[PDB]
């Protein structure tokens, strides 16, 4: 029953919940061994798992299509943020093995912390689809939502952010030491607003260009 | 839900079936086929050891589907 | 017997429940001694008498310190 439910939450729709491309996992089926009001409880829980499905498809299609090493870094942090949602599905069944007395409310209870992360990162994922940005100005729209105000979605975006700067030190190691360019496609060789994030000082970027250029001679 | 999870495992099982069929048609020249299937065979040698260790833990349980699929996530990605 | 030993596992489960109860209350008692106390109340006993016994015995180890 909840062996079924804790894998329905992992992503499989089933014939208790019906997947949809408007809002997934819709229950309206009545059961006399369940409470009639229980559905309402279930509905709230459904909103979590749907997003967990909608993210994973997003990771599958990428890496006009969207391409880049930034698409290998946003999706990368999207892997690590979803991991305590996996751990907390294991621990729940671990508790259910010993105590079968605990009801659906303990599930709803235990995963209350993911009703803060999922919408506030869902809007960022939607922004990255509706706009077609894939270049270096993706660091800007990730960086402005880093400030947060809800702490657990405040730190999770930090997890992704460092990765991007670690990726931006692969380009700025080939450029700055060996004078090597086009080991990644671009977002003599001029400075443009797309290839430079708009909260890094422009004078430092001029120093960067000079140091990269002088190596080849 | 059962029909979906075993389907996902089946989609991975096609990719192992094609490779094993390719290997069987060598021991049952091009001058690079043998050098390529050698590395493929070595990959299977490592991968099968990992999997048989999980089965060794089955003879000695508390392991469910959701444990081994999350464990084998970085390998089924590498398979694709 | 199989059901007679799962009851013994059940005894150990409540004994760990009383283990958490003993630490949050900061008692000196361990698990073996509390099983002795459980057998004592199987025969029937004042807890007010057992506490006087243990409230003599523990602070008669502080008299040979």
């Amino acid at each position: 029953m909840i062996h079924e439910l804790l894998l329905a939450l992992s992503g499989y729709p089933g014939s208790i919940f019906t997947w949809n491309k408007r809002s997934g996992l819709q229950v309206s089926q009545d059961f006399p061994f369940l409470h009639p009001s229980e559905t309402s409880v279930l509905n709230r829980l459904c909103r979590l798992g749907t997003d967990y499905i909608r993210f994973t498809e997003f990771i599958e299609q990428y890496t006009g299509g969207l391409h880049g090493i930034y698409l290998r870094a946003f999706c990368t942090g999207l892997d690590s943020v979803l991991q305590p949602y996996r751990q907390a599905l294991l621990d729940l069944e671990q508790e259910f093995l010993g105590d079968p007395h605990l009801s659906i409310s303990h599930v709803n209870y235990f995963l209350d912390q993911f009703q803060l992360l999922f919408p506030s990162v869902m809007v960022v994922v939607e922004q990255i689809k509706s706009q077609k940005i894939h270049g270096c100005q993706i660091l800007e729209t990730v960086y402005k939502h880093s400030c947060g105000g809800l702490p657990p979605v405040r730190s999770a975006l930090e997890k992704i952010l460092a990765v991007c700067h670690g990726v931006m030190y692969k380009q700025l190691s080939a450029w700055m030491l060996h004078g090597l360019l086009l080991d990644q496609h671009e977002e003599q060789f001029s400075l443009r607003v797309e290839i430079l994030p708009s909260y890094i000082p422009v004078r430092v970027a001029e120093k960067i260009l000079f140091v990269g250029e002088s190596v080849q001679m | 839900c059962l029909r979906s999870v075993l389907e996902q495992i089946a989609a991975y099982g096609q990719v192992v079936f094609r490779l094993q069929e390719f290997i069987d048609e060598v021991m049952g020249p091009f001058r690079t086929y043998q050098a390529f299937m050698w590395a493929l065979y070595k990959y299977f040698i490592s991968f099968k050891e990992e999997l048989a260790e999980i089965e060794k833990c089955i003879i000695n349980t508390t392991i469910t589907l959701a444990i081994v699929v999350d464990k084998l996530a970085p390998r089924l990605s590498q398979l694709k | 017997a199989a059901a007679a030993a799962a009851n013994l596992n059940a005894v150990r489960e409540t004994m760990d429940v009383l283990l958490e109860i003993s630490r949050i209350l900061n008692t000196g008692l361990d698990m073996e001694t509390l099983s002795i106390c459980v057998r004592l109340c199987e025969q029937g006993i004042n807890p007010e008498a057992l506490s006087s016994v243990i409230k003599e015995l523990r602070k008669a180890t502080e008299a040979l310190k």
């Binding site: 093995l97 010993g98 | 469910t64 | 005894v11 459980v38």
Partner: peptide, 23 residues
């Protein structure tokens, strides 16, 4: 008597068809 018999190896095999306290 209790503590002498308590020290035994418990259930580590878990049932998925007998979820509630598998012997």
């Amino acid at each position: 008597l209790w503590e002498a018999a308590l020290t035994y190896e418990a259930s580590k095999r878990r049932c998925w068809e007998r979820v509630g306290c598998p012997p």
